[PDB]
Amino acid sequence: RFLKVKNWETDVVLTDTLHLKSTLETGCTEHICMGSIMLPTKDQLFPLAKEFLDQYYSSIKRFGSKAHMDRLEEVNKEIESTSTYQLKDTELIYGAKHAWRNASRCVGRIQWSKLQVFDARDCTTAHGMFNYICNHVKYATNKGNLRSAITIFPQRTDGKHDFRVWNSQLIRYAGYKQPDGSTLGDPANVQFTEICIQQGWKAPRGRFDVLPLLLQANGNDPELFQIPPELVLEVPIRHPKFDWFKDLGLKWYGLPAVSNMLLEIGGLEFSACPFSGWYMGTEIGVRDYCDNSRYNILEEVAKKMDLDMRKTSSLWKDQALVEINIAVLYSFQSDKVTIVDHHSATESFIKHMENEYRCRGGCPADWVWIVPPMSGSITPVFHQEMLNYRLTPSFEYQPDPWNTHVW
Amino acid sequence: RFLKVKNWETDVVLTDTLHLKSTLETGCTEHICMGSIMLPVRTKDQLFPLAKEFLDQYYSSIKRFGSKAHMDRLEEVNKEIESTSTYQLKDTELIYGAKHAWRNASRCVGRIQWSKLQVFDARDCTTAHGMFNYICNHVKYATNKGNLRSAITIFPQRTDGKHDFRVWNSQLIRYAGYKQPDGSTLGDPANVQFTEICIQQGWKAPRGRFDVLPLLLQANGNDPELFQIPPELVLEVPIRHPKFDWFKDLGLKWYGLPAVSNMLLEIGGLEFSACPFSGWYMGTEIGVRDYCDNSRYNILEEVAKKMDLDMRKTSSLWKDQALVEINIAVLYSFQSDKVTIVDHHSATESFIKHMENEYRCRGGCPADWVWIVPPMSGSITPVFHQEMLNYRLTPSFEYQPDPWNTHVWK
Numbered sequence A: 001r002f003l004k005v006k007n008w009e010t011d012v013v014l015t016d017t018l019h020l021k022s023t024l025e026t027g028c029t030e031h032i033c034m035g036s037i038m039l040p041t042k043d044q045l046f047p048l049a050k051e052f053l054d055q056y057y058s059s060i061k062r063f064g065s066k067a068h069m070d071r072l073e074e075v076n077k078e079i080e081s082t083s084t085y086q087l088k089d090t091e092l093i094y095g096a097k098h099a100w101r102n103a104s105r106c107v108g109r110i111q112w113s114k115l116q117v118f119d120a121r122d123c124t125t126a127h128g129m130f131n132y133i134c135n136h137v138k139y140a141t142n143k144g145n146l147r148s149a150i151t152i153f154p155q156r157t158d159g160k161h162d163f164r165v166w167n168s169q170l171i172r173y174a175g176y177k178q179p180d181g182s183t184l185g186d187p188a189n190v191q192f193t194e195i196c197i198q199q200g201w202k203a204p205r206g207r208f209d210v211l212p213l214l215l216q217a218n219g220n221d222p223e224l225f226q227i228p229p230e231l232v233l234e235v236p237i238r239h240p241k242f243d244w245f246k247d248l249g250l251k252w253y254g255l256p257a258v259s260n261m262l263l264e265i266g267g268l269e270f271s272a273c274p275f276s277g278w279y280m281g282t283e284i285g286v287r288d289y290c291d292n293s294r295y296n297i298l299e300e301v302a303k304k305m306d307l308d309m310r311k312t313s314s315l316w317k318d319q320a321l322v323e324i325n326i327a328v329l330y331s332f333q334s335d336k337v338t339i340v341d342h343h344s345a346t347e348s349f350i351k352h353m354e355n356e357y358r359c360r361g362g363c364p365a366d367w368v369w370i371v372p373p374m375s376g377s378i379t380p381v382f383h384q385e386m387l388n389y390r391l392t393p394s395f396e397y398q399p400d401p402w403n404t405h406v407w
Numbered sequence B: 001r002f003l004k005v006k007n008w009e010t011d012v013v014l015t016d017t018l019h020l021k022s023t024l025e026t027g028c029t030e031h032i033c034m035g036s037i038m039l040p041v042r043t044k045d046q047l048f049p050l051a052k053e054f055l056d057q058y059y060s061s062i063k064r065f066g067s068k069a070h071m072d073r074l075e076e077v078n079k080e081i082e083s084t085s086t087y088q089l090k091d092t093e094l095i096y097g098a099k100h101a102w103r104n105a106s107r108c109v110g111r112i113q114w115s116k117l118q119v120f121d122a123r124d125c126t127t128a129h130g131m132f133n134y135i136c137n138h139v140k141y142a143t144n145k146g147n148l149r150s151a152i153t154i155f156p157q158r159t160d161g162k163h164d165f166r167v168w169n170s171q172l173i174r175y176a177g178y179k180q181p182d183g184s185t186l187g188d189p190a191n192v193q194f195t196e197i198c199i200q201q202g203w204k205a206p207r208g209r210f211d212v213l214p215l216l217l218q219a220n221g222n223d224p225e226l227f228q229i230p231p232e233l234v235l236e237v238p239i240r241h242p243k244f245d246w247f248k249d250l251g252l253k254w255y256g257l258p259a260v261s262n263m264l265l266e267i268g269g270l271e272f273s274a275c276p277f278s279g280w281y282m283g284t285e286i287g288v289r290d291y292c293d294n295s296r297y298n299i300l301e302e303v304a305k306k307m308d309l310d311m312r313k314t315s316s317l318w319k320d321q322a323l324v325e326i327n328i329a330v331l332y333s334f335q336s337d338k339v340t341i342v343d344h345h346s347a348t349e350s351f352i353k354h355m356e357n358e359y360r361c362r363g364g365c366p367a368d369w370v371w372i373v374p375p376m377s378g379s380i381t382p383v384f385h386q387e388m389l390n391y392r393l394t395p396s397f398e399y400q401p402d403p404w405n406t407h408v409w410k
């Protein structure tokens, strides 16, 4: 059944058929919509594997070819024998690029095809993992000129030899609970910062302490490693008109690199697949800096702006929020570190979406996540109806490693 | 069954059971979610169960479920339906229905006020002039010299779908929109189509930037008629900025009373096609959407320019900067002219407390996240960090085709 999507700002209407190939289930029903909920075998493997291969070969204009059929046969025999199979290089690259392409929560998918894939499937140890990761961080940072990339470690086998990167991101600041009862650093990482301490990490106890990597290979216990400081590009935050901003003492890292997700390609599961691209301003400025549960810096910045914080109707929070995001962008740009603002990012996504509609006949998109956390309606995506559904290959969430590992 | 909802800013988790009483569809399937989609004559037979459901709820709420008063009413209603195909609601039921339609509106963030709603029974109305008189009284009462009071006027329910009462305006008070051969739009672009119809029907437009539109009223299914609202009844607020003295020179102003008038109210199966309702504005409705939407007044560039902001590159966030000031101004003005209004911060905080209270006393509170979260400063309002469950409960306010696309002219 054809579905239509209307942009209420331009009246442009797109027709979606791509949803017809929807695999998994959204979490919604005809009776209830859970759109805003953050998270709603051989017989199983071969079918999934087939869907993927038919998909790949169709993309390379060889659907049905002998190569297509051969490969399809080879995998079956391989699955029937090894109860699993291995992706050829080409299928891995395609799989990862397409997992990104299908990421309904990513606003920067217009860059999906320019992804650098690092095949880390030959890795066997944590040090090996550290080595691959460092090279990933270095290649991707490129001295400020960020380049998207993903490193894929060995796929899951029996589930007891899983490769995992316990960190939620390759680079994040430590969080510590203090005497007062308050929290120093990033509250979002308190638990992990603890797991690292208990493991031996000599935590510095600072506001912005770059966490160590906790790498798990072949189901073994995780090991700690310190990313070469020379490899962690950071931007000191200063304002273009408030010379007092520098006194806030804020700084953030330039490389966003989600590393706790699971990559699925043709039925196979890669539980260690850190990936990186570059920041959209609001991610840091609005969410990391201003979320009540994160660095919660709104009051401070307000004060120094000398504005009436007596009543909410003065919109002092909104006032401050804007200046703060001005500074993040300003800084990154001043130090020549790649970064994109919500206006450019969202406009780009709209274009990508239009391309995706005429070239794929659709584009899965999660409105709740696509629309920036600030100035929502003044960005194009706000007025754009979206259809959300799941397509594989995909990036999925997965239980925290510490919540299920057998030490 | 039980469905959990979590607030990622407090870790507070709520359990929903109310969704079980959900009857209608959502547009969402098990394979596809359409949460961001704007808008995805009954038989005498299908009517009784609906009436029953509604009545069982009414009586349950007044704590007389199963009583003789309850039983006889069902008997009375079923009888009436069979013999007349329809049925009339008792005043008490109508007031209960209206309050609950509001109580169930998943796109409304001001529901903490649902219980305090003034219901005006206009069911004895038979003509447009009569509807005009009724609306005038609604506007005067609700406005209350700037101290707004929520209220709704309910005109005769649908019968055969041929004698429908309709308020052609989308809001009782709204500014006209005119398209110039130039291609530009004068006034409110959103009301261009309706404006043309008014002119075609006989209205003589002042052709200005903020012309209060005339009421186009349809009674008992007859052709719509024009009426101008008594100017002394239309409260307006000129918009000025607390610190930007040039703001007042932007020539901006807006009306104080928001009153959607094109929705359909459904109570116990009964359909009320003319049910204008009003409460008070949340600042962002005017400051963000009405003033800054590209397809509305679109004042950003001008407010930006006059603020002398670097508009050479979006990354300077001049748009975001201007937007705040403009919303600063809408709020300030209303407060200065003592006209009720609430900012998005207060409004969303209150809604969270309302929502929590609703989970504890009702077992849920259907909410549309896409609509509840404000069009600016999204994540610095609690609703953003709040998971919500959207589902439909009756009584309800529904959308309905524009009268001009269905009306059989006489």
Ligand code: HEM
Pocket: A096, A100, A103, A105, A106, A107, A108, A109, A111, A115, A148, A149, A150, A258, A261, A275, A276, A277, A278, A279, A280, A283, A340, A345, A395
């Ligand atoms: C090149 C620049 C990129 C930009 C500017 C971009 C931007 C974004 C933004 C703003 C989010 C929301 C983040 C949050 O709220 O936590 C996001 C989420 C996401 N992006 Fe992208 N992205 C980019 C590259 C990538 C890459 C390289 C991949 C994969 C190969 C990817 C996969 C995803 C996924 C899986 C999510 C959702 C993660 C989650 O659920 O927490 N993105 N992206």
Ligand code: HEM
Pocket: B098, B102, B105, B107, B108, B109, B110, B111, B113, B117, B150, B151, B152, B260, B277, B278, B279, B280, B281, B282, B285, B342, B347, B397
């Ligand atoms: C006391 C003042 C009230 C406030 C501050 C409030 C606020 C809001 C806001 C911000 C919206 C979204 C508007 C938009 O984006 O166009 C809305 C929607 C809604 N409200 Fe309320 N509301 C209030 C009173 C009422 C009343 C009295 C009723 C009904 C009796 C009601 C029924 C609804 C409905 C049905 C919608 C959705 C309308 C649509 O789909 O366009 N509200 N409300």
Ligand SMILES: C[C@H](O)[C@H](O)[C@H]1CNc2nc(N)[nH]c(=O)c2N1
Pocket: A036, A037, A038, A368, A369, A370, B008, B384, B385, B386, B387, B388
């Ligand atoms: C409860 C709600 O789902 C939650 O706050 C979502 C909303 N939208 C979001 N959007 C993005 N990009 N990132 C997030 O973490 C969230 N959080």
Ligand SMILES: C[C@H](O)[C@H](O)[C@H]1CNc2nc(N)[nH]c(=O)c2N1
Pocket: A008, A382, A383, A384, A385, A386, B036, B037, B038, B370, B371, B372
């Ligand atoms: C396409 C999208 O559904 C649309 O822009 C919605 C988003 N949220 C909204 N929220 C409110 N309150 N009002 C609106 O008009 C909208 N528009």
Ligand SMILES: N=C(NCCC[C@H](N)C(=O)O)N[N+](=O)[O-]
Pocket: A256, A257, A258, A275, A276, A277, A278, A279, A280, A283, A284, A287, A288
């Ligand atoms: N932009 C990206 N964001 C991933 C999550 C980062 C998180 N919001 C934060 O630290 O703010 N990914 N990427 O570009 O690969």
Ligand SMILES: N=C(NCCC[C@H](N)C(=O)O)N[N+](=O)[O-]
Pocket: B258, B259, B260, B277, B278, B279, B280, B281, B282, B285, B286, B289, B290
């Ligand atoms: N607040 C209310 N809003 C109704 C819609 C008004 C519209 N967004 C606008 O004119 O901006 N309802 N109410 O209070 O009854």
Ligand SMILES: [Zn+2]
Pocket: A028, A029, A032, A033, A034, A035, B028, B032, B033, B034, B035
């Ligand atoms: Zn849904």
